[PDB]
């Protein structure tokens, strides 16, 4: 939809590790200052980025971020060979149990059914 | 016998008990320690303690 | 580590020391001055820095640096000591708070008066 990534991405450029996690539209950007500037250029609006390892050389960090974006897969890749209708659906994402307990809230009723 | 056992198996109430297993299990006790010696001096005793048909 | 190693106390929490052990986890400590003198810094610096030897109320003896320009500290003077290390002076890890019981503020100070114990001039 021009604002986030299709799924979770993990890439290993030489001595650098980058992780990308999709977020709901309007959530915002959670990343370092360097990646914040890069996201503005590309148009990414909602994402969480975590980078670790030997990050002294910023050329490698930018290169790793560039390569990670190119490892995504789309629902329309070779769809003609599936014989089905790949339909977009609305499903709210969940958080871990610890987050619910600390905030004093409940998950969707579909899981609490008892 | 295992970790929690202190005697050998198949011991009836009438049969006697020994300390052969306790030495093997709790081998760290100083009461069961010996002095350094040669291989033959240490192996010969163990060999005879298992075969009762050798003088 | 394996599961067995972790169960048998494999991991031990790292322990970090304090930078002012003589304070016994207290923000400040009172003491009495034993000797007042000057010392020279290490390379590449050069100066005659004012220091004093103070015996704390807990019985420990430490070296304290006197900030500012000039002081009226003598032997047998009650002072209050806080943390803080002077990098160029080896072995000095404490500083004297000015304006308190016996130490007075620097005369003529106009800026950062609070850090040197000088009251605001009413005139």
């Amino acid at each position: 939809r021009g604002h986030t990534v299709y799924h979770h991405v993990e890439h290993h450029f030489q001595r650098v590790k980058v992780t990308l996690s999709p977020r709901t539209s309007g959530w915002g950007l959670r990343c370092s200052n360097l990646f914040y500037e890069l996201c503005s250029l590309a148009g990414i609006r909602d994402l969480t980025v975590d980078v670790s390892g030997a990050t002294r050389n910023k050329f490698f960090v930018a290169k790793a971020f560039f390569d990670a974006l190119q490892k995504q897969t789309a629902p329309h890749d070779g769809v003609e060979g599936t014989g089905v209708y790949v339909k977009e659906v609305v499903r709210r994402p969940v958080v871990n149990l610890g987050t619910y307990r600390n905030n004093g809230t409940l998950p969707p009723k579909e899981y609490l059914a008892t | 016998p295992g970790x929690x056992x202190x005697x050998x198996x198949x011991x009836x109430x009438x049969x006697x008990x020994x300390x052969x297993x306790x030495x093997x299990x709790x081998x760290x006790x100083x009461x069961x320690x010996x002095x350094x010696x040669x291989x033959x001096x240490x192996x010969x005793x163990x060999x005879x303690x298992x075969x009762x048909x050798x003088x | 580590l394996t599961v067995g190693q972790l169960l048998r106390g494999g991991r031990t929490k790292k322990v970090r020391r304090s930078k002012s052990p003589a304070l016994e986890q207290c923000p400040y400590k009172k003491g009495i001055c034993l000797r007042v003198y000057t010392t020279a810094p290490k390379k590449p610096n050069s100066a005659n820095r004012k220091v004093c030897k103070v015996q704390l109320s807990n019985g420990y003896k430490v070296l304290a640096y006197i900030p500012g320009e000039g002081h009226n500290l003598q032997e047998h003077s009650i002072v209050l000591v806080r943390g803080g290390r002077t990098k160029d002076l080896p072995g000095v890890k404490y500083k004297v708070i000015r304006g308190k019981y016996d130490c007075a503020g620097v005369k003529g100070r106009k800026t950062s008066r609070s850090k040197y114990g000088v009251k605001r001039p009413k005139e």
Binding site: - | X4, X7, X8, X9 | -
Partner: protein
């Protein structure tokens, strides 16, 4: 908890008494594993004829002594006991006669065939019950 246990007999040196070993696990929240542990319990044996190595079932009971608060209810497996007289008879049979290569192999084949045939009949009966 602790109403009933199944364990192994590790001591029969007391009068109408026995010690039984038990295995259990404990959850360690920090490492997400189950830790295997052991315990020892003393039980009352009315028969006073238990053998070290037996598997028995013990049940909670009224306190009888300082360290005895259980009673032996049943035995699930009896420990093997060496018997010299029986072993000697078996040795005599083994030494009584010997067979050649072909005779022994043929006898082995016949015995397996008979065992297989009986097993097939039992399996068919089980299917019929189903």
């Amino acid at each position: 908890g602790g109403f009933e246990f199944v364990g192994k007999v590790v001591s029969n040196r007391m009068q109408k008494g026995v010690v039984v070993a038990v295995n259990y696990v404990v959850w360690i929240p920090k490492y997400k594993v189950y830790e295997r542990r052991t315990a020892r319990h003393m039980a009352h044996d009315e028969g006073n004829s238990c053998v070290i190595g037996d598997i028995v079932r013990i049940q909670q009971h009224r306190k009888l002594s300082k360290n005895k608060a259980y009673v032996v209810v049943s035995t699930l497996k009896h420990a093997d006991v060496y018997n010299a007289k029986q072993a000697a008879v078996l040795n005599t049979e083994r030494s009584q006669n010997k067979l050649g290569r072909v005779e022994y192999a043929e006898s082995r084949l016949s015995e397996v065939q008979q065992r297989l045939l009986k097993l097939r009949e039992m399996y068919q009966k089980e299917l019929a019950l189903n």
